[PDB]
Amino acid sequence: IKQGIREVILCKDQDGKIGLRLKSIDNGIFVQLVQANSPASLVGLRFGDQVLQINGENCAGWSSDKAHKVLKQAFGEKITMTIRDRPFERTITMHKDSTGHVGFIFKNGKITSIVKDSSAARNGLLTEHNICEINGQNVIGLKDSQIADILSTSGTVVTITIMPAFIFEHIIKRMAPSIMKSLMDHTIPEV
Numbered sequence: 001i002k003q004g005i006r007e008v009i010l011c012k013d014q015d016g017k018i019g020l021r022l023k024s025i026d027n028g029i030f031v032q033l034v035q036a037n038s039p040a041s042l043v044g045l046r047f048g049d050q051v052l053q054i055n056g057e058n059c060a061g062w063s064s065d066k067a068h069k070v071l072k073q074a075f076g077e078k079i080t081m082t083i084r085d086r087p088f089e090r091t092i093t094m095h096k097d098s099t100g101h102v103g104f105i106f107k108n109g110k111i112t113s114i115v116k117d118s119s120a121a122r123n124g125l126l127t128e129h130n131i132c133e134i135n136g137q138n139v140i141g142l143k144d145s146q147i148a149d150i151l152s153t154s155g156t157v158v159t160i161t162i163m164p165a166f167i168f169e170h171i172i173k174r175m176a177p178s179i180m181k182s183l184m185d186h187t188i189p190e191v
């Protein structure tokens with residue numbers, strides 16, 4: 001999480017798509033889904049990001065429908081967006097022990113207990129928190145086993161990005177779970 005507003009320049013694909021779904025939260029507009037291999041994913045939009053402006057117009061107070069209409073009605077030559085980076089999330093760095101543990105339990109991507117005297121414990125990992133990213137890779141909508149596998153495969157250092165569940169549950173509301181599994185970009189970013 002950068003403490004930064006940043007500008008992205010985005011460009012509709014052949015199909016007139018940017019690969020984005022937006023959600024109204026607390027009178028802002030937040031990214032609910034970034035589609036794989038999309039304009040939004042290439043410019044590095046992330047689940048949880050706040051859209052401050054689209055083409056220089058302020059997003060405050062907009063409904064989700066308005067935000068999707070706006071994106072649709074724009075000329076797809078160049079859309080500019082002003083982004084605040086994943087403001088509802090935090091990143092925690094942890095170290096695997098010798099037996100390859102960081103020291104929590106999670107169910108449906110939500111952390112539910114911290115294991116006594118673990119790295120997770122020393123680092124102040126909280127429960128009632130949804131896992132959003134692992135080492136910069138979105139894991140939202142993957143099965144628990146697959147999150148476990150990314151944790152195994154990771155080096156001894158592990159970075160986790162988490163969001164209070166009440167906020168997480170509000171963002172993903174009305175988005176059908178299979179879309180999250182299928183469409184939400186789960187790739188390492190490209191260079």
Ligand SMILES: COc1cccc2[nH]ccc12
Binds near residue numbers: 065068
């Ligand atoms: C294509 O028209 C729409 C787009 C988005 C939201 C909508 N609600 C009622 C119609 C409608």
